[PDB]
Design a protein around this ligand. Structure first.
Ligand code: HEM
Ligand SMILES: Cc1ccc(Br)cc1
Length: 431
């Protein structure tokens, strides 16, 4: 049978994600009772909810069967779940398809492979070591401002958001004065279904509102990035904007400018927001588990373990969607050609078949098998940058902290997509 309606709504609807407790209880109910079922929520396409760690790997390692963008019918699948009204809006705007960005999530092989190779080497761990000292100087400046502002603050909007944004804008060559605009458009981009993040220029109550907001935000990013692409093509610099802007195909022709725009939208949004969420989530967990803060201050080599467990618990990127290009049997179910799948990374990260006491915050999982970056050819390109920035910031910050207390109500972004904390009121005790 279909998944029961309120479990299905809890996971599919953005409102279902407002509060982590009921959301994670819905993922757990599925993993234990209906690990591979079809959600049939009014206003959405039917979705196979991929809740199990092994099933996430099985789907993601088979891109010839489970496409992101629809295969040769490019743009026939939206890799980021919109409602039906929203996909209809986008098909009206684009003329029959859903490929609203030329960013990696929308691409299938071999196009995905050619485009990804423009930046694959830049993002490898050995090629990121050259940025470690700049990252550390940015962390130290951020910590100097935290110490100067006193013990009481929102650890998200008054601390965690700024460091990853500065790091990524510095690695582009985007001037510091443009950070507020990039932050505002990122809130519009990941807030399409959040009641406190609605743009003024869209009909907020329309059935397609989130899709209108997505499109409006992309158009603003395009206007900003068209100037940066033209600037770096005319005057190349030693920065990531130039690598993207001047990229040429195998025939010596620039990739179309929208491909550079796609890289820029992804790096200007996911490039900072996910790291901010994970840092804020880590601080929240150190407040719940003060013994972990004591241990990591005692042994700074535990910092990468703390990062890995923060990534598993926070898992801020909640899903991408796939479409079956042929019928496929998995876990005793018959997925049909054309059926859509929702990859629930947060649920894979609580799978008791893989993680002992999966809801516990345990930095001593070695190895820490989390799937917070996904899997397969679409696996997060930024993962090594995120792990470096989180390591560097914790190495600099934790010596300055004796204790984190949460002093007010945490708030999450209401999204089924790229979520995590927007507010974490704290009282810090400095060492
Ligand atoms: C804590 C930090 C982050 C987490 C948890 C995260 C998570 C993810 C996840 C789950 C995916 C989808 C993988 C899949 O489809 O199997 C993804 C894709 C992606 N992420 Fe990350 N991300 C983070 C940081 C970053 C950073 C720092 C950047 C860039 C500077 C970045 C850029 C991307 C891009 C471009 C994609 C699309 C890859 C593709 O479709 O091939 N991410 N990320
Ligand atoms: C996680 C993520 C990557 C690329 C885009 Br575009 C949006 C979100």
């Amino acid at each position: 049978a279909a998944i029961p309606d309120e479990i299905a709504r809890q996971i599919v609807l953005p409102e279902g994600h407002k509060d982590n407790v009921p959301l994670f209880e819905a993922y757990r109910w599925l993993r234990e009772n209906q690990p591979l079922g079809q959600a049939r929520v009014e206003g959405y396409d039917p979705l196979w909810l991929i809740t199990k760690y092994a099933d996430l790997m099985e789907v993601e390692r088979q891109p010839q069967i489970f496409a992101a963008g629809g295969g040769e019918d490019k743009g026939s699948n939206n890799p980021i779940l919109a409602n039906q009204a929203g996909d209809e809006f986008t098909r009206q705007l684009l003329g029959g398809n859903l490929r609203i960005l030329d960013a990696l999530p929308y691409l299938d092989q071999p196009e995905h492979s050619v485009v990804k190779d423009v930046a694959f080497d830049w993002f490898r761990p050995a090629n990121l070591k050259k940025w470690e000292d700049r990252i550390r100087e940015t962390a130290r400046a951020s910590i100097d401002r935290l110490l100067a502002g006193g013990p009481d603050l929102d650890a998200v909007q008054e601390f965690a958001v700024f460091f990853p944004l500065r790091v990524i804008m510095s690695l582009f060559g985007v001037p510091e004065e443009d950070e507020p605009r990039m932050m505002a458009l990122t809130q519009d981009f990941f807030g399409v279904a959040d009641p406190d993040a609605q743009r003024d220029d869209i009909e907020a109550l329309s059935p397609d509102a989130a899709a209108q907001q997505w499109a409006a935000t992309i158009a603003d990013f395009y206007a900003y990035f068209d100037v940066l692409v033209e600037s770096r093509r005319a005057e190349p610099r030693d920065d990531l904007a130039t690598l993207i802007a001047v990229a040429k195909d195998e025939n010596g022709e620039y990739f179309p400018k929208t491909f550079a725009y796609g890289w820029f939208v992804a790096i200007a949004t996911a490039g900072h927001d996910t790291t901010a969420s994970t840092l804020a989530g880590c601080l929240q967990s150190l407040a719940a588990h003060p013994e972990v803060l004591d241990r990591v201050k005692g042994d700074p080599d535990l910092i990468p373990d703390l990062v890995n467990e923060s990534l598993r618990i926070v898992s801020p990127v909640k899903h991408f969607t796939r479409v079956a290009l042929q019928d496929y049997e998995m876990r005793g179910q018959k997925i049909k050609a054309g059926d859509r799948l929702m990859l629930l990374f947060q649920s894979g990260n609580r799978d008791a078949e893989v993680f002992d006491r999966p809801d516990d915050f345990d930095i001593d999982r070695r190895p820490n098998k989390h799937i917070a970056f996904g899997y397969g050819p679409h696996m997060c390109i930024g993962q090594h940058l995120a792990k470096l920035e989180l390591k560097v910031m914790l190495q600099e910050l934790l010596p300055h902290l004796e204790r984190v207390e949460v002093s007010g109500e945490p708030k999450l972004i209401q999204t089924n997509f790229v979520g995590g904390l927007r507010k974490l009121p704290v009282h810090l005790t400095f060492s």
